[PDB]
Amino acid sequence: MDLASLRAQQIELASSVIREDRLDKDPPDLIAGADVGFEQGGEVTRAAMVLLKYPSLELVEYKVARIATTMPYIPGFLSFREYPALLAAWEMLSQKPDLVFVDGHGISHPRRLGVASHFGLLVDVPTIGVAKKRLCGKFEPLSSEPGALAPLMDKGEQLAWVWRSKARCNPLFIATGHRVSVDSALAWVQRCMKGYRLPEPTRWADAV
């Protein structure tokens, strides 16, 4: 069972996610944005990484990796196909960021191991999940103003902050990836806003 040991790996990694602040460099000098997806109906995994300066939020570099998908889609295990592409893009970076924002779920994931937690943990860098849609859990519907804020709850636990970053946009689901608390994850995303729906690092990562 490659399937039973996949599952085993998963619950171990979910266990090892750090849910408290552990930045080695606060404030960061350099942050990064990350995006992953699939091309060729799943045969190629593509990941984009972006480096910005903090606090300016200036683009200084970006890199795209494309690799062949080696694992097929298996429900619950998307982070294992996504992870290798993010790793490849990461290793193209000419310097390493102090904090990483991933376009995707942190612990706010059925298995507590969204791609942002998966990546953050294997690479061991402070990481935040900035997701565009709910995956699991529940929240009190948000009022329509910018700054509307509700906790995302599952099983008695807060997995994320649901935060309307911008008027007339759908909200963000901001969760710890690795080595960032849920409340600091929100704080850091808010610090990395300019005038769009997404914070700059993942906006940039999607744009390249």
Author numbering: 1 to 208
Sentences from the paper on this structure:
To investigate the substrate recognition and catalytic mechanism of EcEndoV, we solved the crystal structure of apo EcEndoV. In order to obtain diffraction-quality crystals, the 9-residue, C-terminal fragment was truncated. The resultant construct is prone to aggregation, but still retains the deoxyinosine-specific endonuclease activity (data not shown). This construct contains residues M1-A214 (named EcEndoV-SF) and it forms plate crystals in a condition containing PEG 3350. The crystals belong to an orthorhombic system with the space group P212121, and each asymmetric unit contains two monomers. Both chains are almost completely intact with no internal disorders and of good electron density: chain A is visible from M1-V208 and chain B is visible from M1-S210. The enzyme displays the ‘RNase H-like motif’. Two of the most important elements for substrates binding and recognition are the PYIP motif consisting of residues P72, Y73, I74 and P75, and the hypoxanthine-binding pocket comprising hydrophobic residues Y73, P75, and L78 and V115 (corresponding to I122 in TmEndoV). Additionally, four conserved glycines G76, G104, G106 and G114 also participate in the formation of the rigid pocket and their backbone atoms are involved in hypoxanthine recognition. No Mg2+ is found at the cleavage site. The r.m.s. deviation is 1.4 Å over 204 Cα atoms between EcEndoV-SF and apo TmEndoV.
To counteract the mutational effects of deamination damages, a unique alternative excision repair pathway has evolved, in which the enzyme endonuclease V (EndoV) plays an important role. EcEndoV primarily incises deoxyinosine (dI) in DNA19 at the second phosphodiester bond 3′ to the lesion, producing a nick with a 3′-hydroxyl and a 5′-phosphoryl group. In addition, EcEndoV also cleaves the U, O, X, apurinic/apyrimidinic (AP) site, insertion/deletion mismatches (IDM), flaps, loops and pseudo-Y DNA structures, when Mn2+ is supplied as a metal cofactor. EcEndoV is the first member discovered in the EndoV family and it has a broad substrate spectrum.
